[PDB]
Amino acid sequence: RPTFYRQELNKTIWEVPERYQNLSPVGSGAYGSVCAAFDTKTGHRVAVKKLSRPFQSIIHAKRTYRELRLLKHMKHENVIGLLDVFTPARSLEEFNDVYLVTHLMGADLNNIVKCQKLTDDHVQFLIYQILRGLKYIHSADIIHRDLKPSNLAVNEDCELKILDFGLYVATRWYRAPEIMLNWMHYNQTVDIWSVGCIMAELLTGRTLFPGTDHIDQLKLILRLVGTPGAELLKKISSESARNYIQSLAQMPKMNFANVFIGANPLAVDLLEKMLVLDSDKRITAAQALAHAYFAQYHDPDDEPVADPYDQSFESRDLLIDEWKSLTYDEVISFVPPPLDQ
Ligand SMILES: CCC(CC)NC(=O)[C@H](CCC1CCCCC1)NC(=O)c1ccc(CNC(=O)c2cnn(-c3ccccc3)c2N)cc1
């Protein structure tokens, strides 16, 4: 066990190993209760998140366990990973606080598009890295579900990582129509719809579908992709949903070349394959990596899949102290990543 030291920052008690120095809060609460710190073992800047009221309810306790499980799993270049996890507690009985350590990322894409309209080369490289991380996540049967520019972090070298900061940029603007609506018939490709919306915004400098609500959002979407045909209508099981869709005056699919005018036609083609209403016909991440648009980056020998992830906990209903105990187990069993850098 290492030696901890205590301090206070902006309303909150922080107790961390001497290893981590010079804590400075970042983001004004936009990312949680998070500090930049200097890690004395590597000489690298890191981010330290202290979880807020991790075991306050069964729901918090489960969310805490879930976040720690997901973070301990993620071992890929384009996905946030876990550098360390600790608590000042010496025993389960004392266990009340969870701290997570990750790399400190430079800026999010919300900032980087709200600066400029990117070059086609920058778009290629950023979307390629998103899809490479998604291939990995998806291969473990994990769905992100909340992809949007503020959940992607990029460093000065343009290296990108996928994260989820949790609850400016509305989620609904990037969300696939099938989980705007029924939340019933959906696959991993809900994340590919989000990548299509992100890529459009990078190319044009404008949010593709800036809806005010779920109805408006859907209206904007149908105006681009057109109203469902009989084949897609065949597969909507919700009567209310189906009634609403068919209630609208029918709309044709736009020619995406006339919408994204002047863009690389290969970018336009990929967007046609990502922004399809029918989720069974939407391109997967693994397929998108082989698309000609990424010819300069794609290497099929360097697009790894993940180890399997045991999500079986998700279907369990346990007590607070049980989720807490499990979370403690996971803190204890943590094996830090190689230092080599
Ligand atoms: C917390 C809510 C919950 C909602 C679901 N989500 C999670 O469970 C995921 C877990 C893993 C996910 C799973 C899906 C794929 C992406 C990773 N959890 C994280 O992604 C997660 C993300 C971050 C952290 C701690 N690090 C920071 O806060 C941090 C790092 N750099 N910067 C920075 C960025 C730009 C400029 C300046 C500074 C920060 N602010 C710790 C966990």
mmCIF file of C-alpha atoms and ligand atoms in Angstrom:
data_model
loop_
_atom_site.group_PDB
_atom_site.id
_atom_site.type_symbol
_atom_site.label_atom_id
_atom_site.label_comp_id
_atom_site.label_asym_id
_atom_site.label_seq_id
_atom_site.Cartn_x
_atom_site.Cartn_y
_atom_site.Cartn_z
ATOM 1 C CA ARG A 1 0.000 0.000 0.000
ATOM 2 C CA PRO A 2 1.386 3.414 -0.912
ATOM 3 C CA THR A 3 1.373 6.551 1.187
ATOM 4 C CA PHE A 4 -1.562 8.834 0.646
ATOM 5 C CA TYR A 5 -1.798 12.559 1.190
ATOM 6 C CA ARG A 6 -4.974 14.652 1.701
ATOM 7 C CA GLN A 7 -6.128 18.021 0.307
ATOM 8 C CA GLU A 8 -9.372 19.906 -0.605
ATOM 9 C CA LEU A 9 -10.390 21.303 -4.008
ATOM 10 C CA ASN A 10 -13.561 23.317 -4.895
ATOM 11 C CA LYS A 11 -15.928 21.857 -2.288
ATOM 12 C CA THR A 12 -14.349 18.355 -2.196
ATOM 13 C CA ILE A 13 -11.857 16.177 -0.186
ATOM 14 C CA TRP A 14 -9.109 14.496 -2.328
ATOM 15 C CA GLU A 15 -6.998 11.678 -0.884
ATOM 16 C CA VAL A 16 -4.467 10.279 -3.316
ATOM 17 C CA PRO A 17 -1.111 8.486 -3.382
ATOM 18 C CA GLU A 18 2.024 10.677 -3.155
ATOM 19 C CA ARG A 19 2.798 9.354 -6.599
ATOM 20 C CA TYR A 20 0.294 11.901 -8.034
ATOM 21 C CA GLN A 21 1.273 15.595 -7.576
ATOM 22 C CA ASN A 22 0.044 19.109 -8.419
ATOM 23 C CA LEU A 23 -3.670 18.421 -8.719
ATOM 24 C CA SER A 24 -5.517 21.078 -10.680
ATOM 25 C CA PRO A 25 -9.208 20.845 -11.457
ATOM 26 C CA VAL A 26 -10.159 20.803 -15.129
ATOM 27 C CA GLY A 27 -13.327 21.621 -17.123
ATOM 28 C CA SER A 28 -15.389 23.372 -14.362
ATOM 29 C CA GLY A 29 -17.467 20.193 -13.710
ATOM 30 C CA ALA A 30 -17.993 19.406 -17.423
ATOM 31 C CA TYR A 31 -16.134 16.082 -17.031
ATOM 32 C CA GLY A 32 -17.063 15.187 -13.445
ATOM 33 C CA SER A 33 -14.889 15.802 -10.388
ATOM 34 C CA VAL A 34 -11.558 15.544 -12.297
ATOM 35 C CA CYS A 35 -7.987 16.829 -11.740
ATOM 36 C CA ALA A 36 -4.986 17.117 -13.960
ATOM 37 C CA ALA A 37 -1.974 15.766 -12.027
ATOM 38 C CA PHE A 38 1.646 14.904 -12.562
ATOM 39 C CA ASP A 39 2.397 11.180 -12.134
ATOM 40 C CA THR A 40 5.847 10.809 -10.530
ATOM 41 C CA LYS A 41 6.320 7.194 -11.648
ATOM 42 C CA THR A 42 6.275 8.057 -15.393
ATOM 43 C CA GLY A 43 6.781 11.843 -15.411
ATOM 44 C CA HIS A 44 3.540 12.090 -17.508
ATOM 45 C CA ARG A 45 0.531 14.289 -16.903
ATOM 46 C CA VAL A 46 -2.577 12.253 -16.006
ATOM 47 C CA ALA A 47 -6.229 12.822 -15.227
ATOM 48 C CA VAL A 48 -7.657 11.673 -11.905
ATOM 49 C CA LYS A 49 -11.429 11.307 -11.524
ATOM 50 C CA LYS A 50 -12.972 10.951 -8.096
ATOM 51 C CA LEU A 51 -16.380 9.344 -8.409
ATOM 52 C CA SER A 52 -19.284 11.314 -6.926
ATOM 53 C CA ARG A 53 -21.344 9.357 -4.400
ATOM 54 C CA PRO A 54 -20.402 6.025 -6.006
ATOM 55 C CA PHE A 55 -22.470 3.852 -3.537
ATOM 56 C CA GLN A 56 -25.377 6.222 -2.705
ATOM 57 C CA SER A 57 -28.028 3.895 -4.202
ATOM 58 C CA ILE A 58 -28.268 0.533 -5.913
ATOM 59 C CA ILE A 59 -28.203 2.462 -9.189
ATOM 60 C CA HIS A 60 -25.083 4.469 -8.422
ATOM 61 C CA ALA A 61 -23.414 1.361 -7.049
ATOM 62 C CA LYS A 62 -24.142 -0.572 -10.240
ATOM 63 C CA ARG A 63 -23.017 2.333 -12.438
ATOM 64 C CA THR A 64 -19.803 2.549 -10.508
ATOM 65 C CA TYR A 65 -19.143 -1.177 -10.949
ATOM 66 C CA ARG A 66 -20.052 -0.898 -14.635
ATOM 67 C CA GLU A 67 -17.679 2.005 -15.259
ATOM 68 C CA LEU A 68 -14.835 0.221 -13.576
ATOM 69 C CA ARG A 69 -15.470 -3.055 -15.424
ATOM 70 C CA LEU A 70 -15.573 -1.232 -18.813
ATOM 71 C CA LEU A 71 -12.443 0.776 -18.081
ATOM 72 C CA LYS A 72 -10.468 -2.274 -16.898
ATOM 73 C CA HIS A 73 -11.421 -4.011 -20.147
ATOM 74 C CA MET A 74 -10.445 -1.338 -22.648
ATOM 75 C CA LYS A 75 -6.982 -2.010 -24.112
ATOM 76 C CA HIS A 76 -6.720 -0.262 -27.417
ATOM 77 C CA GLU A 77 -5.005 2.749 -28.903
ATOM 78 C CA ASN A 78 -8.241 4.569 -29.793
ATOM 79 C CA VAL A 79 -10.215 3.874 -26.634
ATOM 80 C CA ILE A 80 -9.683 5.461 -23.165
ATOM 81 C CA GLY A 81 -7.843 3.097 -20.864
ATOM 82 C CA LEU A 82 -7.255 2.695 -17.113
ATOM 83 C CA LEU A 83 -3.794 3.737 -15.863
ATOM 84 C CA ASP A 84 -4.702 3.166 -12.221
ATOM 85 C CA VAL A 85 -7.630 2.817 -9.837
ATOM 86 C CA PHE A 86 -7.329 3.355 -6.097
ATOM 87 C CA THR A 87 -9.126 4.174 -2.867
ATOM 88 C CA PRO A 88 -7.699 5.470 0.451
ATOM 89 C CA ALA A 89 -9.652 2.674 2.206
ATOM 90 C CA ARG A 90 -7.789 -0.270 3.765
ATOM 91 C CA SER A 91 -10.755 -2.638 4.032
ATOM 92 C CA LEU A 92 -14.166 -3.211 2.474
ATOM 93 C CA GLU A 93 -15.701 -1.739 5.664
ATOM 94 C CA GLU A 94 -13.963 1.599 5.143
ATOM 95 C CA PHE A 95 -14.455 1.487 1.324
ATOM 96 C CA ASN A 96 -16.327 4.635 0.251
ATOM 97 C CA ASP A 97 -14.364 6.493 -2.536
ATOM 98 C CA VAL A 98 -13.118 5.435 -5.970
ATOM 99 C CA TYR A 99 -10.544 7.262 -7.955
ATOM 100 C CA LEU A 100 -9.817 6.572 -11.611
ATOM 101 C CA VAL A 101 -6.612 7.529 -13.421
ATOM 102 C CA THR A 102 -6.384 7.864 -17.208
ATOM 103 C CA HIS A 103 -4.274 9.721 -19.684
ATOM 104 C CA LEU A 104 -4.909 13.429 -19.794
ATOM 105 C CA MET A 105 -6.323 14.171 -23.335
ATOM 106 C CA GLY A 106 -5.664 17.571 -25.051
ATOM 107 C CA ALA A 107 -9.038 18.785 -26.413
ATOM 108 C CA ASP A 108 -12.389 17.368 -27.617
ATOM 109 C CA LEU A 109 -13.733 17.469 -31.158
ATOM 110 C CA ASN A 110 -16.466 19.908 -30.154
ATOM 111 C CA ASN A 111 -13.567 22.449 -29.735
ATOM 112 C CA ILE A 112 -11.657 21.335 -32.790
ATOM 113 C CA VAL A 113 -14.645 21.655 -35.270
ATOM 114 C CA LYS A 114 -15.802 24.849 -33.473
ATOM 115 C CA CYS A 115 -12.284 26.135 -34.420
ATOM 116 C CA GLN A 116 -12.090 25.188 -38.127
ATOM 117 C CA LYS A 117 -13.503 23.103 -40.908
ATOM 118 C CA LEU A 118 -10.951 20.279 -41.149
ATOM 119 C CA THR A 119 -9.026 19.187 -44.213
ATOM 120 C CA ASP A 120 -10.096 15.968 -45.984
ATOM 121 C CA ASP A 121 -6.903 14.330 -44.800
ATOM 122 C CA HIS A 122 -7.656 15.261 -41.165
ATOM 123 C CA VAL A 123 -11.197 13.978 -41.593
ATOM 124 C CA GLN A 124 -9.866 10.679 -43.011
ATOM 125 C CA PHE A 125 -7.510 10.158 -40.115
ATOM 126 C CA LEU A 126 -9.939 11.091 -37.333
ATOM 127 C CA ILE A 127 -12.840 9.011 -38.661
ATOM 128 C CA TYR A 128 -10.466 6.093 -39.361
ATOM 129 C CA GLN A 129 -9.371 6.154 -35.700
ATOM 130 C CA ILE A 130 -13.018 6.356 -34.477
ATOM 131 C CA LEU A 131 -13.933 3.307 -36.574
ATOM 132 C CA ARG A 132 -10.865 1.391 -35.475
ATOM 133 C CA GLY A 133 -11.773 1.901 -31.779
ATOM 134 C CA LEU A 134 -15.408 0.982 -32.587
ATOM 135 C CA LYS A 135 -14.391 -2.241 -34.304
ATOM 136 C CA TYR A 136 -12.693 -3.131 -31.025
ATOM 137 C CA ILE A 137 -15.582 -2.098 -28.695
ATOM 138 C CA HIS A 138 -18.151 -3.738 -30.927
ATOM 139 C CA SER A 139 -16.209 -6.965 -31.001
ATOM 140 C CA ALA A 140 -16.630 -7.247 -27.239
ATOM 141 C CA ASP A 141 -20.453 -6.792 -27.708
ATOM 142 C CA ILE A 142 -20.269 -3.316 -26.224
ATOM 143 C CA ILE A 143 -22.275 -0.417 -27.747
ATOM 144 C CA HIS A 144 -21.141 3.083 -27.049
ATOM 145 C CA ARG A 145 -24.579 4.704 -27.616
ATOM 146 C CA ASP A 146 -23.543 8.204 -26.972
ATOM 147 C CA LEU A 147 -21.021 9.087 -29.577
ATOM 148 C CA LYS A 148 -20.716 12.844 -30.208
ATOM 149 C CA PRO A 149 -17.861 15.266 -30.624
ATOM 150 C CA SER A 150 -17.474 16.041 -26.892
ATOM 151 C CA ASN A 151 -16.916 12.293 -26.275
ATOM 152 C CA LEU A 152 -13.869 12.123 -28.554
ATOM 153 C CA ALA A 153 -10.582 13.456 -27.467
ATOM 154 C CA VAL A 154 -7.708 14.299 -29.738
ATOM 155 C CA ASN A 155 -4.075 15.321 -28.869
ATOM 156 C CA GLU A 156 -1.835 17.666 -30.845
ATOM 157 C CA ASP A 157 -0.536 14.683 -32.917
ATOM 158 C CA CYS A 158 -4.212 14.058 -34.009
ATOM 159 C CA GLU A 159 -4.300 10.771 -32.143
ATOM 160 C CA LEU A 160 -7.900 10.130 -31.074
ATOM 161 C CA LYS A 161 -9.510 8.258 -28.206
ATOM 162 C CA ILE A 162 -13.164 7.317 -27.687
ATOM 163 C CA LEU A 163 -14.552 7.953 -24.161
ATOM 164 C CA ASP A 164 -17.878 8.745 -22.490
ATOM 165 C CA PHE A 165 -17.902 11.626 -20.011
ATOM 166 C CA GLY A 166 -21.596 11.028 -19.218
ATOM 167 C CA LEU A 167 -24.144 13.687 -18.156
ATOM 168 C CA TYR A 168 -23.660 22.685 -25.644
ATOM 169 C CA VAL A 169 -23.674 19.418 -27.757
ATOM 170 C CA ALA A 170 -26.984 17.483 -27.560
ATOM 171 C CA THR A 171 -26.841 13.670 -27.755
ATOM 172 C CA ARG A 172 -30.019 13.587 -29.817
ATOM 173 C CA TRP A 173 -28.256 15.347 -32.708
ATOM 174 C CA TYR A 174 -26.015 12.236 -33.232
ATOM 175 C CA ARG A 175 -28.507 9.534 -32.305
ATOM 176 C CA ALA A 176 -29.766 6.842 -34.684
ATOM 177 C CA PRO A 177 -33.491 7.102 -35.522
ATOM 178 C CA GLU A 178 -34.288 3.516 -34.195
ATOM 179 C CA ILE A 179 -33.254 4.479 -30.642
ATOM 180 C CA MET A 180 -34.704 7.961 -30.903
ATOM 181 C CA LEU A 181 -37.945 6.237 -31.208
ATOM 182 C CA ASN A 182 -38.708 2.664 -30.130
ATOM 183 C CA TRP A 183 -35.385 1.558 -28.525
ATOM 184 C CA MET A 184 -36.411 -2.054 -29.561
ATOM 185 C CA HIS A 185 -34.820 -3.283 -32.847
ATOM 186 C CA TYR A 186 -31.184 -1.996 -32.708
ATOM 187 C CA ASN A 187 -27.616 -3.249 -33.201
ATOM 188 C CA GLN A 188 -24.045 -2.028 -32.795
ATOM 189 C CA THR A 189 -24.570 0.119 -35.903
ATOM 190 C CA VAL A 190 -26.427 2.806 -33.833
ATOM 191 C CA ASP A 191 -22.795 3.934 -33.295
ATOM 192 C CA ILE A 192 -22.128 4.034 -37.026
ATOM 193 C CA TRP A 193 -25.064 6.512 -37.525
ATOM 194 C CA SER A 194 -23.334 8.716 -34.943
ATOM 195 C CA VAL A 195 -20.004 8.456 -36.767
ATOM 196 C CA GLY A 196 -21.796 9.494 -40.035
ATOM 197 C CA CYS A 197 -23.237 12.601 -38.258
ATOM 198 C CA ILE A 198 -19.831 13.446 -36.776
ATOM 199 C CA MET A 199 -18.030 13.016 -40.102
ATOM 200 C CA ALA A 200 -20.616 15.247 -41.888
ATOM 201 C CA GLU A 201 -20.026 17.984 -39.279
ATOM 202 C CA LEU A 202 -16.271 17.730 -39.667
ATOM 203 C CA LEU A 203 -16.563 18.042 -43.420
ATOM 204 C CA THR A 204 -19.043 20.994 -43.430
ATOM 205 C CA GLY A 205 -18.539 22.778 -40.054
ATOM 206 C CA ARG A 206 -22.256 22.445 -39.223
ATOM 207 C CA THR A 207 -24.290 20.022 -37.191
ATOM 208 C CA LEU A 208 -26.020 17.757 -39.675
ATOM 209 C CA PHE A 209 -29.307 17.283 -37.798
ATOM 210 C CA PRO A 210 -29.668 19.946 -35.074
ATOM 211 C CA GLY A 211 -33.208 18.959 -33.932
ATOM 212 C CA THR A 212 -34.997 20.624 -31.015
ATOM 213 C CA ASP A 213 -36.516 17.378 -29.743
ATOM 214 C CA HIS A 214 -37.168 13.778 -30.782
ATOM 215 C CA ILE A 215 -39.932 14.677 -33.263
ATOM 216 C CA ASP A 216 -37.996 17.596 -34.839
ATOM 217 C CA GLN A 217 -34.832 15.464 -34.906
ATOM 218 C CA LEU A 218 -36.629 12.736 -36.803
ATOM 219 C CA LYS A 219 -38.065 15.327 -39.275
ATOM 220 C CA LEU A 220 -34.599 16.618 -40.086
ATOM 221 C CA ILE A 221 -33.318 13.088 -40.512
ATOM 222 C CA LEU A 222 -36.121 12.049 -42.877
ATOM 223 C CA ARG A 223 -35.580 15.164 -44.939
ATOM 224 C CA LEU A 224 -32.082 13.863 -45.813
ATOM 225 C CA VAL A 225 -32.534 10.111 -45.927
ATOM 226 C CA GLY A 226 -36.179 10.084 -47.052
ATOM 227 C CA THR A 227 -39.162 8.422 -45.452
ATOM 228 C CA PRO A 228 -39.025 4.624 -44.912
ATOM 229 C CA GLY A 229 -40.023 2.425 -47.828
ATOM 230 C CA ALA A 230 -42.325 -0.599 -47.491
ATOM 231 C CA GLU A 231 -39.319 -2.881 -46.699
ATOM 232 C CA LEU A 232 -38.256 -0.894 -43.707
ATOM 233 C CA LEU A 233 -41.933 -0.338 -42.729
ATOM 234 C CA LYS A 234 -42.354 -4.128 -42.743
ATOM 235 C CA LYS A 235 -39.899 -4.324 -39.796
ATOM 236 C CA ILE A 236 -41.398 -1.722 -37.473
ATOM 237 C CA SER A 237 -43.258 -3.532 -34.760
ATOM 238 C CA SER A 238 -44.415 -0.405 -32.904
ATOM 239 C CA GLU A 239 -47.839 0.502 -34.212
ATOM 240 C CA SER A 240 -47.598 4.084 -32.889
ATOM 241 C CA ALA A 241 -44.196 4.521 -34.506
ATOM 242 C CA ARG A 242 -45.414 3.011 -37.779
ATOM 243 C CA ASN A 243 -48.532 5.190 -37.667
ATOM 244 C CA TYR A 244 -46.546 8.311 -37.144
ATOM 245 C CA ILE A 245 -44.057 7.578 -39.971
ATOM 246 C CA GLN A 246 -46.781 6.705 -42.455
ATOM 247 C CA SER A 247 -48.739 9.792 -41.247
ATOM 248 C CA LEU A 248 -46.016 12.057 -42.683
ATOM 249 C CA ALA A 249 -46.099 13.261 -46.239
ATOM 250 C CA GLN A 250 -43.687 10.961 -48.057
ATOM 251 C CA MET A 251 -40.145 12.297 -48.743
ATOM 252 C CA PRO A 252 -37.474 11.177 -51.162
ATOM 253 C CA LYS A 253 -33.930 10.303 -50.315
ATOM 254 C CA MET A 254 -31.628 13.105 -51.231
ATOM 255 C CA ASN A 255 -28.608 12.605 -53.483
ATOM 256 C CA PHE A 256 -25.782 13.065 -50.929
ATOM 257 C CA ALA A 257 -23.467 14.498 -53.624
ATOM 258 C CA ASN A 258 -25.883 17.461 -53.854
ATOM 259 C CA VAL A 259 -25.883 17.853 -50.110
ATOM 260 C CA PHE A 260 -22.193 17.587 -49.348
ATOM 261 C CA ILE A 261 -21.225 19.586 -52.374
ATOM 262 C CA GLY A 262 -17.488 19.734 -53.112
ATOM 263 C CA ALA A 263 -16.563 16.913 -50.699
ATOM 264 C CA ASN A 264 -14.322 14.017 -51.666
ATOM 265 C CA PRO A 265 -16.699 11.626 -53.491
ATOM 266 C CA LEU A 266 -15.293 8.747 -51.497
ATOM 267 C CA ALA A 267 -16.305 10.651 -48.275
ATOM 268 C CA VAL A 268 -19.784 11.130 -49.836
ATOM 269 C CA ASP A 269 -20.023 7.424 -50.650
ATOM 270 C CA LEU A 270 -19.106 6.372 -47.140
ATOM 271 C CA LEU A 271 -21.688 8.774 -45.697
ATOM 272 C CA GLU A 272 -24.349 7.128 -47.910
ATOM 273 C CA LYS A 273 -23.307 3.767 -46.328
ATOM 274 C CA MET A 274 -23.375 5.103 -42.707
ATOM 275 C CA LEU A 275 -26.537 7.210 -42.785
ATOM 276 C CA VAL A 276 -29.081 4.551 -43.887
ATOM 277 C CA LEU A 277 -32.290 4.354 -42.049
ATOM 278 C CA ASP A 278 -32.381 0.564 -42.046
ATOM 279 C CA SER A 279 -29.993 -0.599 -39.420
ATOM 280 C CA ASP A 280 -29.622 -4.065 -41.036
ATOM 281 C CA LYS A 281 -28.146 -2.376 -44.131
ATOM 282 C CA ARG A 282 -25.871 0.134 -42.419
ATOM 283 C CA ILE A 283 -22.143 -0.478 -42.829
ATOM 284 C CA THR A 284 -20.392 -1.986 -39.740
ATOM 285 C CA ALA A 285 -17.141 -0.572 -38.319
ATOM 286 C CA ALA A 286 -15.058 -3.482 -39.694
ATOM 287 C CA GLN A 287 -16.564 -3.033 -43.148
ATOM 288 C CA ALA A 288 -16.061 0.758 -42.999
ATOM 289 C CA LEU A 289 -12.338 0.346 -42.260
ATOM 290 C CA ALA A 290 -11.915 -1.415 -45.647
ATOM 291 C CA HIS A 291 -13.742 1.416 -47.478
ATOM 292 C CA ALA A 292 -11.645 3.105 -50.140
ATOM 293 C CA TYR A 293 -11.834 6.469 -48.262
ATOM 294 C CA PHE A 294 -9.318 5.113 -45.714
ATOM 295 C CA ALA A 295 -6.850 3.663 -48.261
ATOM 296 C CA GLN A 296 -3.934 5.591 -46.765
ATOM 297 C CA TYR A 297 -4.542 4.370 -43.177
ATOM 298 C CA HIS A 298 -6.216 0.984 -43.406
ATOM 299 C CA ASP A 299 -4.079 -1.949 -42.302
ATOM 300 C CA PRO A 300 -6.068 -5.158 -41.734
ATOM 301 C CA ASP A 301 -3.207 -6.566 -39.667
ATOM 302 C CA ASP A 302 -3.434 -3.641 -37.280
ATOM 303 C CA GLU A 303 -7.171 -3.350 -36.471
ATOM 304 C CA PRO A 304 -7.481 -5.662 -33.483
ATOM 305 C CA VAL A 305 -10.555 -7.089 -31.837
ATOM 306 C CA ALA A 306 -11.129 -7.224 -28.100
ATOM 307 C CA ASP A 307 -11.055 -10.013 -25.584
ATOM 308 C CA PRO A 308 -14.534 -11.151 -24.655
ATOM 309 C CA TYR A 309 -16.276 -9.084 -22.016
ATOM 310 C CA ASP A 310 -18.536 -10.640 -19.387
ATOM 311 C CA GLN A 311 -21.624 -8.431 -19.356
ATOM 312 C CA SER A 312 -23.612 -11.040 -17.456
ATOM 313 C CA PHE A 313 -23.708 -8.676 -14.370
ATOM 314 C CA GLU A 314 -25.989 -6.369 -16.312
ATOM 315 C CA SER A 315 -28.970 -8.681 -15.822
ATOM 316 C CA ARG A 316 -28.470 -8.979 -12.013
ATOM 317 C CA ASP A 317 -30.438 -7.187 -9.260
ATOM 318 C CA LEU A 318 -28.231 -6.927 -6.196
ATOM 319 C CA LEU A 319 -28.024 -4.856 -3.027
ATOM 320 C CA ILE A 320 -25.803 -1.757 -2.645
ATOM 321 C CA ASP A 321 -23.317 -3.571 -0.432
ATOM 322 C CA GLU A 322 -23.059 -6.337 -2.992
ATOM 323 C CA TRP A 323 -22.311 -4.000 -5.916
ATOM 324 C CA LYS A 324 -19.905 -2.241 -3.524
ATOM 325 C CA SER A 325 -18.155 -5.515 -2.674
ATOM 326 C CA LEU A 326 -17.777 -6.399 -6.322
ATOM 327 C CA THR A 327 -16.358 -3.008 -7.106
ATOM 328 C CA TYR A 328 -13.811 -3.516 -4.254
ATOM 329 C CA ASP A 329 -12.801 -6.868 -5.710
ATOM 330 C CA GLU A 330 -12.130 -5.162 -9.022
ATOM 331 C CA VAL A 331 -10.087 -2.381 -7.396
ATOM 332 C CA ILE A 332 -7.988 -5.099 -5.656
ATOM 333 C CA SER A 333 -7.466 -7.293 -8.655
ATOM 334 C CA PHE A 334 -6.361 -4.341 -10.906
ATOM 335 C CA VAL A 335 -2.979 -5.031 -12.666
ATOM 336 C CA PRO A 336 -1.482 -1.810 -13.965
ATOM 337 C CA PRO A 337 -0.448 -1.507 -17.619
ATOM 338 C CA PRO A 338 3.193 -1.710 -18.790
ATOM 339 C CA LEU A 339 5.233 1.497 -18.200
ATOM 340 C CA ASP A 340 7.202 1.150 -21.552
ATOM 341 C CA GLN A 341 6.970 4.489 -23.458
HETATM 342 C C1 LIG B 1 -18.857 8.320 -16.518
HETATM 343 C C2 LIG B 1 -20.109 8.024 -17.227
HETATM 344 C C3 LIG B 1 -20.117 6.717 -18.018
HETATM 345 C C4 LIG B 1 -21.298 6.835 -18.989
HETATM 346 C C5 LIG B 1 -21.628 5.541 -19.666
HETATM 347 N N1 LIG B 1 -18.858 6.529 -18.745
HETATM 348 C C6 LIG B 1 -18.126 5.416 -18.680
HETATM 349 O O1 LIG B 1 -18.472 4.416 -18.081
HETATM 350 C C7 LIG B 1 -16.793 5.426 -19.402
HETATM 351 C C8 LIG B 1 -16.304 3.992 -19.409
HETATM 352 C C9 LIG B 1 -15.710 3.349 -20.623
HETATM 353 C C10 LIG B 1 -16.317 3.736 -21.995
HETATM 354 C C11 LIG B 1 -17.109 2.573 -22.598
HETATM 355 C C12 LIG B 1 -17.516 2.810 -24.047
HETATM 356 C C13 LIG B 1 -16.317 3.136 -24.904
HETATM 357 C C14 LIG B 1 -15.607 4.353 -24.374
HETATM 358 C C15 LIG B 1 -15.180 4.145 -22.926
HETATM 359 N N2 LIG B 1 -15.838 6.299 -18.743
HETATM 360 C C16 LIG B 1 -15.028 7.136 -19.401
HETATM 361 O O2 LIG B 1 -15.003 7.208 -20.631
HETATM 362 C C17 LIG B 1 -14.098 7.976 -18.582
HETATM 363 C C18 LIG B 1 -13.564 9.103 -19.186
HETATM 364 C C19 LIG B 1 -12.631 9.877 -18.531
HETATM 365 C C20 LIG B 1 -12.197 9.547 -17.250
HETATM 366 C C21 LIG B 1 -11.147 10.365 -16.530
HETATM 367 N N3 LIG B 1 -10.414 11.286 -17.387
HETATM 368 C C22 LIG B 1 -10.845 12.517 -17.651
HETATM 369 O O3 LIG B 1 -11.883 12.987 -17.180
HETATM 370 C C23 LIG B 1 -10.049 13.285 -18.624
HETATM 371 C C24 LIG B 1 -8.991 12.876 -19.459
HETATM 372 N N4 LIG B 1 -8.612 13.823 -20.295
HETATM 373 N N5 LIG B 1 -9.436 14.881 -20.012
HETATM 374 C C25 LIG B 1 -9.383 16.030 -20.861
HETATM 375 C C26 LIG B 1 -9.783 15.924 -22.188
HETATM 376 C C27 LIG B 1 -9.756 17.043 -23.004
HETATM 377 C C28 LIG B 1 -9.340 18.263 -22.503
HETATM 378 C C29 LIG B 1 -8.943 18.367 -21.183
HETATM 379 C C30 LIG B 1 -8.958 17.255 -20.357
HETATM 380 C C31 LIG B 1 -10.297 14.598 -18.999
HETATM 381 N N6 LIG B 1 -11.196 15.461 -18.513
HETATM 382 C C32 LIG B 1 -12.735 8.435 -16.644
HETATM 383 C C33 LIG B 1 -13.672 7.651 -17.291
#
